[PDB]
Amino acid sequence: SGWVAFDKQVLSFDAYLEEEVLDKSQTNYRIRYYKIYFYPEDDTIQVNEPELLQGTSIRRHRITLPPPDEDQFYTVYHFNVGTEVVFYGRTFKIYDCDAFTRNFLRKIGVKVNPPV
Amino acid sequence: SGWVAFDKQVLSFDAYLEEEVLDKSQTNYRIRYYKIYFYPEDDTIQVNEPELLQGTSIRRHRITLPPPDEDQFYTVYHFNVGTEVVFYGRTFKIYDCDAFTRNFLRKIGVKVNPPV
């Protein structure tokens, strides 16, 4: 034991969400861009907005699937281009991921979806 | 009467929406881009996707506001960058409009919102 191997490097997905503020009957919005990191070593997830400010990040931890599956956690198999994920009630729309991540997904048998 | 004037030219807004397909517990999506036209002469609206295919257009007609205001129709004052509009249950997110439209909005006292 003790061999040096970085075979559990984080997978990264580019996502966005619309912050939709309901002002009476009118809904205004802005688009916010995030990088979603998935750590294969412990199946934890972390989210950060590359750009008192609220909603800029989600700490590294295992995130439960939304209801009615809160007894389970998100796995790497739940992520793909053109797929939506829900963290703390907010819907993140994944639209891309880098080559390293695309290669990893291919290695685990996942077919990455076409551009959104 | 009979004077030639093109003082009621259409206003155009660039919008997008996510076609979100729910497959069991998983939601996949794609982004579709539309041009929304508003006609000041009769307050009608028309939508077209510049790009059997369904959801590519909405014919020119006055569109009712979503519930609970279906007794009223959309007006030019309901459109702005960073504003959402709902046509036939679908949410369109306006993200831009041309100079002609921005100029018209200024002329009617509307402050166009900053980029989304």
Specify the 3-state DSSP secondary structure of B2: coil
Element (H or E) spanning A78, and its range?
none
| Residue closest to A80 by CA, chosen among A48, A57, A112, A46 | A112
Which residues, listed in sequence order, are joined to residue B32 by a DSSP beta bridge?
B17
Q: Which of B30, B80, B92 would best serve as a mutation to test chain A binding (most A beta carbons within 10 A)? A: B30
Q: Does A29 touch chain B (CB under 8 A)?
A: yes
Q: Domain ranges in chain A?
A: 1-116
Q: Match 């004037």 to its residue by tokens.
A: B5
Report d(CA B64, CA B86) in Å as an integer.
9
**DSSP tag of A109:** T
Chain A residues whose beta carbon lies within 8 Å of the beta carbon of residue B78: 26
Token digits of residue B24 = 């069991």
Question: Are residues A28 and B69, on separate chains, in Cβ contact within 8 Å?
Answer: no
Q: How many CB atoms lie within 10 A of CB A22?
A: 10
Element (H or E) spanning A44, and its range?
strand A44-48
Q: Do A83 and A96 meet the contact criterion of CB atoms below 8 Å apart?
A: no
Question: What's the CATH number of domain A1-116, 3.20.20.80, 2.60.120.10, 2.40.50.100, 2.30.29.170?
Answer: 2.30.29.170
Q: What's the residue count for chain A?
A: 116
Experimental method: X-ray
Question: Are residues B93 and A28, on separate chains, in Cβ contact within 8 Å?
Answer: no
Q: Do B82 and B94 meet the contact criterion of CB atoms below 8 Å apart?
A: yes
Q: Does B25 touch chain A (CB under 8 A)?
A: yes
Q: Could you give the C-alpha distances from A101 to A64, A95, A106, B62, B74, in angstroms and in order?
A: 22, 13, 9, 47, 45
Which residues, listed in sequence order, are joined to residue B22 by a DSSP beta bridge?
B27
Q: Measure the CA angle with vertex B36, ends B95 and B49; round to 5°.
A: 95
**DSSP tag of B77:** G
